[PDB]
């Protein structure tokens, strides 16, 4: 103003994972079309922000990072995310280094994980060739092995962008209502 309560952002930040790995064109373009849609569908109610720092590292020797992303920079980015959610705008992270929900499981971010799922590995393969194949297939396969109810908040398995967008919007409109009762008053 053992602990029973963990402090989390006032609006759970939306993080997209799948169909495959970020940094490659199939995943990057498929997620971008979704971010583009959110930007206009939730205009005035959403903040979409790039996170390049490796927020997977968020949680008597001093703890340090062995990559270019420091624990101080990560902490700065965690505080920026909490602060962006403080007035209850929807928050969406374009988080470069998160390709799997287990990478945020131990943070205090409590994300809404949106799984952009290609149901068939054969469809994913052909997609990639239509444009480093094996790292992409393994990442998609890892996603497909997660227990869906506990790992993901939304699964977009629709093959039409229009239908994936409306399903995600429906979810985010309901979250909006849950967080804004009338009684309270790639990118």
């Amino acid at each position: 103003f053992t602990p029973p309560y963990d402090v989390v952002p006032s609006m759970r930040p939306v993080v997209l994972v799948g169909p495959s790995l970020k940094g490659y064109e199939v995943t990057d373009m498929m997620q971008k079309a979704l971010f583009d849609f959110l930007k206009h569908r939730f205009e005035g109610r959403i903040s979409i922000t790039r996170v390049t720092a490796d927020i997977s590292l968020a949680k008597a020797i001093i703890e340090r990072s062995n990559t270019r992303s420091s624990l101080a920079e990560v902490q700065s980015e965690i505080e920026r995310i909490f602060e962006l959610a403080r007035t209850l705008q929807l928050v969406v992270l374009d988080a470069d280094t998160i390709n799997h929900p287990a990478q945020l499981s131990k943070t205090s971010l409590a994300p809404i994980i949106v799984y952009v799922k290609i149901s068939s590995p054969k469809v994913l393969q052909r997609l990639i060739k239509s444009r480093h194949l094996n790292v992409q297939m393994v990442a998609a396969d890892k996603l497909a092995q997660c227990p869906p109810q506990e790992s993901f908040d939304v699964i977009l398995d629709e093959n039409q962008l229009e239908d994936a967008c409306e399903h995600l919007a429906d979810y985010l409109e309901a979250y909006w209502k849950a967080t804004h009762p009338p009684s309270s008053n790639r990118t």
Binding site: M30, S119, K122, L127
Partner: peptide
């Protein structure tokens, strides 16, 4: 054929 409609869907998504 379901896989073929899948692929066309995702190709159109990527194009968008």
């Amino acid at each position: 054929q379901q896989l073929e409609e899948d692929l066309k869907g995702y190709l159109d998504w990527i194009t968008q």
